[PDB]
Amino acid sequence: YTDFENTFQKTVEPVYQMHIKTSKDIAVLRSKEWFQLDDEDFDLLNKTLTFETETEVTFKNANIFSSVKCF
Amino acid sequence: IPRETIPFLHLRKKTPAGDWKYDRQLSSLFLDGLEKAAFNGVTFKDKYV
Amino acid sequence: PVMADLNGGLQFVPELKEFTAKLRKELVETSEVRKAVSIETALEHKVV
Incomplete structure (x- = not known):
């Protein structure tokens, strides 16, 4: 089969746990457009974060995604 | 203690420039303690020297 | 003297x-934050 226009996928990812130690980690996190905090001023230093995400992709061909959405 | 007088025994305080100068308040603390000692005696119990 | x-x-x-x-x-x-952020951006570009 090669009708990739008809294909879609949905995976629930493993829970990822991150321990925020330094301001370097906070700077790295805040650089990511996708890391959106409800309270922009939240103090993340010395906090443990868990990310519970889901990925929904559509395929352009075997190896390349026509769209990727993680939330 | 008369004003404009340095007591024979006094304490000093360091200034932002780093030099130590006579301090009326600290010296008053020290001299008041010395007076209390001379009158009532001072204890040193529980002191390890 | x-x-x-x-x-x-x-x-x-x-x-x-x-x-x-x-x-x-x-x-x-400043140095470390800039370096780490640049590394992460490079990795995300290379993976995307």
């Missing part, structure tokens, strides 16, 4: 230890 002061005015800076530590800390912070 002569005493020459060639300290260039540094004696007037208050709390020199803290001031220099602050200066150095701000410089290392």
